[PDB]
Amino acid sequence: STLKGQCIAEFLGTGLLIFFGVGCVAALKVAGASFGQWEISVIWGLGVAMAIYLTAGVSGAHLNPAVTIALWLFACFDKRKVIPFIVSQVAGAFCAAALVYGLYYNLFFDFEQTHHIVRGSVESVDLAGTFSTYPNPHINFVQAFAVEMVITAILMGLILALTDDGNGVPRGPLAPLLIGLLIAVIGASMGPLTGFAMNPARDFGPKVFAWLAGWGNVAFTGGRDIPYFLVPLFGPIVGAIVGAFAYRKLIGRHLPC
Amino acid sequence: STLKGQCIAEFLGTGLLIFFGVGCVAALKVAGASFGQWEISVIWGLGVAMAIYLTAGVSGAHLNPAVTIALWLFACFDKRKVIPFIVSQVAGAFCAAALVYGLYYNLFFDFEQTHHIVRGSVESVDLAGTFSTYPNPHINFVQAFAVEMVITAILMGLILALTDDGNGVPRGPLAPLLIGLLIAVIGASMGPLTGFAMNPARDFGPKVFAWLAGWGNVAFTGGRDIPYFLVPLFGPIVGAIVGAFAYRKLIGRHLPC
Amino acid sequence: STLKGQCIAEFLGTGLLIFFGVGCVAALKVAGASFGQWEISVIWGLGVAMAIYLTAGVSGAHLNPAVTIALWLFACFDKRKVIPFIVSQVAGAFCAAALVYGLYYNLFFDFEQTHHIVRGSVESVDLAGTFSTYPNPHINFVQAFAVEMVITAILMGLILALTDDGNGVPRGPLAPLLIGLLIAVIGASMGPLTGFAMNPARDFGPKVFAWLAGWGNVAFTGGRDIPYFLVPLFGPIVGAIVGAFAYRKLIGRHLPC
Amino acid sequence: STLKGQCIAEFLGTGLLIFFGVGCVAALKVAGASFGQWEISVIWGLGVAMAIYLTAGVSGAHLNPAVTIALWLFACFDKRKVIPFIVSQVAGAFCAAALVYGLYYNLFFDFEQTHHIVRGSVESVDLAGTFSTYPNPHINFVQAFAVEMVITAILMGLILALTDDGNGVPRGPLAPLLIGLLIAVIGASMGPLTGFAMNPARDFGPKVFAWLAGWGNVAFTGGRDIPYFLVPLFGPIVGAIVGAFAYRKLIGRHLPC
DSSP: OOHHHHHHHHHHHHHHHHHHHHHHHHHHHTSOOOOOHHHHHHHHHHHHHHHHHHHHHHHOOOOOHHHHHHHHHHSSOOGGGHHHHHHHHHHHHHHHHHHHHHHTHHHHHHHHHHHTOOTTSSTTHHHHTTTSOOOOTTOOHHHHHHHHHHHHHHHHHHHHHHOSSSSSOOSSSHHHHHHHHHHHHHHHHTHHHHOOOOOHHHHHHHHHHHIIIIITTHHHHTTSSSOTTHHHHHHHHHHHHHHHHHHHHHTOOOOOO | OOHHHHHHHHHHHHHHHHHHHHHHHHHHHTSOOOOOHHHHHHHHHHHHHHHHHHHHHHHOOOOOHHHHHHHHHHSSOOGGGHHHHHHHHHHHHHHHHHHHHHHTHHHHHHHHHHHTOOTTSSTTHHHHTTTSOOOOTTOOHHHHHHHHHHHHHHHHHHHHHHOSSSSSOOSSSHHHHHHHHHHHHHHHHTHHHHOOOOOHHHHHHHHHHHIIIIITTHHHHTTSSSOTTHHHHHHHHHHHHHHHHHHHHHTOOOOOO | OOHHHHHHHHHHHHHHHHHHHHHHHHHHHTSOOOOOHHHHHHHHHHHHHHHHHHHHHHHOOOOOHHHHHHHHHHSSOOGGGHHHHHHHHHHHHHHHHHHHHHHTHHHHHHHHHHHTOOTTSSTTHHHHTTTSOOOOTTOOHHHHHHHHHHHHHHHHHHHHHHOSSSSSOOSSSHHHHHHHHHHHHHHHHTHHHHOOOOOHHHHHHHHHHHIIIIITTHHHHTTSSSOTTHHHHHHHHHHHHHHHHHHHHHTOOOOOO | OOHHHHHHHHHHHHHHHHHHHHHHHHHHHTSOOOOOHHHHHHHHHHHHHHHHHHHHHHHOOOOOHHHHHHHHHHSSOOGGGHHHHHHHHHHHHHHHHHHHHHHTHHHHHHHHHHHTOOTTSSTTHHHHTTTSOOOOTTOOHHHHHHHHHHHHHHHHHHHHHHOSSSSSOOSSSHHHHHHHHHHHHHHHHTHHHHOOOOOHHHHHHHHHHHIIIIITTHHHHTTSSSOTTHHHHHHHHHHHHHHHHHHHHHTOOOOOO
């Protein structure tokens, strides 16, 4: 497939997983749906598994800038398609957040009117957590960064263990379901800490939309002195690089390139 | 298989998925069972997956008028079997709703007696939601129509990605489980909005039964000025056509016909 | 395999599914565990799937007198092994109920002491529901019988659709998981009605143990004028025969014998 | 693979399953996450399934001293690699418990400050249950020992039924998912009794860490006159040996050695 077709798949695949994940969080927050921590995590995992299955044949189903960067550095992914893949992934997450917000538009404004929440204030960060992840109030910036690095390193280890070539997830039903199951257990055990972002596009995209939607600066900072948005922007990237290096050293599986 | 055998499978397959889905909603409403949003959605997805597996060999396991119409327009489905398939699907959903109502007959009347609900009134629409879907009170007709179009377009995209021929779901365990998993995540994220109908037969059939059972006109209108029953009647049909067109343009996979 | 080895597998397989199913109900009742209707049903389905996988190679993994009888009448199952299979299935369920009761012995007596429940009275039927199924208070004997016939007919239809020969469930992972998934959705939608017994051994076995354990006559009658134990004893048997006949007429798939 | 590579896989595989399992229990206890008994058990099962899949090719994916000992006695596992496997498994569980504690460090101390819990006292055993298992207050030492023996015998029976050689779990997706599903149903039905340890390393490792972390002697004794830590240390070992012997007698499947 050409670069244009590969970029469209990454745009659509990332948007698909954001549509399911953010939509279910919106249902729990403003629609009054009853969702447990395991239920929320299994929706994210199954949504990513479905997005991977529908895009693996075309673009390799990266849907993650951290995965794209690590595959370039520790596999056979071409460097010329790194930047277009990341922009497509970020744009897909931004567009899907707008779509979810449009469908839940009336329920969002009803929630603020009931609880007298003024959008853009510190108390509005809880409602801003529908689109992006925010840390537990008891953890700090360094603790939040460590969580993102660890969970993304585990995720990148499974991806490297599943790839046949060095380009991305192989075709078939086995690989997407394994990745989706890993995301579900990660979000159940480490989710209450940092929102198990594991994806720079999954967080930065919806964060930009929330800033445009009226939340303003608290969408990026999250109400903390140190802007929290750096944790999901670089934590997964460092974690994926660390996890990919560990796999290449403890196993060192051969690759075509 | 002949047309008569294919129509029987569509009648039975659609009835099977309504039996599981409506029965579980009845358990949550009048039987006091504890069910979450994810639990309700996963029951609908697994019920459809089982119905597809038991009917794929005979009739292709459409079980959806929107899927049948879209396959006729954008695949190799014959036009002569479009009308008999739709009537069989609608009749199967109507008959299964009567069966569920018969088994829960005593629990239904006990619920109305306890809460002094008069069947056929505006307050009885909540009990009428056991059989068919009704919108969130905060959303409007246009918003409800947009939800149905989006979710059915995603569902039709997966079906077109799984079909080997242009007639319906292929035989095997992989395709029904993928469709069932997609229905579960759709109902978890967009379910609290419009009941994730995605199926004109799943809604119109039980709606006709509820009108006969004593709910009257509120079974179709739902208590709104604009009759809500048009949203699940045509929303999925438009969504499936839109989703099928997008797949044929962004991918354009070859078909035997 | 010889008859002796086949009977041991049916004894162990039926005991395995009772151990998981009754144990989880005991956890919900006397151990204070939080379990939903979908959670209870999925435990029964997965337990049966595991029991089928461990016994399919030896005895065909019947684990159900209704399935054994229907396979004799509408498939190639030998009539000489019908009686020993049923006795092995009933004995396995009885022995597994005693094992679960032994492990939960202290928690059972603590529950009665706290709530002043005298074993053998009408109020003790709720605690007797740990081992066997009892009807919803609002349904009658005829309504309860109809529920058991319908759900067992659906279960027998899937089994006949999966068998390669006419002896039982084939080897492999596909068939047990399909049966387990069907049991889970059946118990979620029709479970709150009659306990989704679907198995004469699953009910009669533990019912005999509960009578020996001190519950007495209310273990069989359930507090009703008509003894409720006839519903799970013959309802599944009639339902399996009806469901097997429907499959042989609407499909008529060829069999070796 | 050499012994050094096999020991690294057992260290990492055991740490991976402890990271998911203990982390989710920490989320339920100190992070306020909503988790049911089935949800907790399915996280343990899926975490073990993922750990088995990532280590089966190298070391056979034992991740259990009871499984390692039983495979040595009733299969073709070499005796020279029994001790290094057990030490690697115990060290992996100890290290993973420290990692989970580090990530939840602030939430742990906040919980004690709110409830005035002094670490090392009898009331602190409830918080010490995050890392290791402790019995139900109504059961005794003998009852707790019987639970561990029974559940580990069932687990060892499935493992022996899945092994092609006599070294460990075979490669592929089927075997790890079957083991993970069995662990989930075991933890749902027998979990509220003894914490469904089934693994000497899963319990002893985190128990040693909890003693170092400040809980002291109550980490091992659990507040009982007879130290409870002997139940998960030897109960699974006896259960695995008993279960392996039963499989070799009731089936007697041939092995290469």
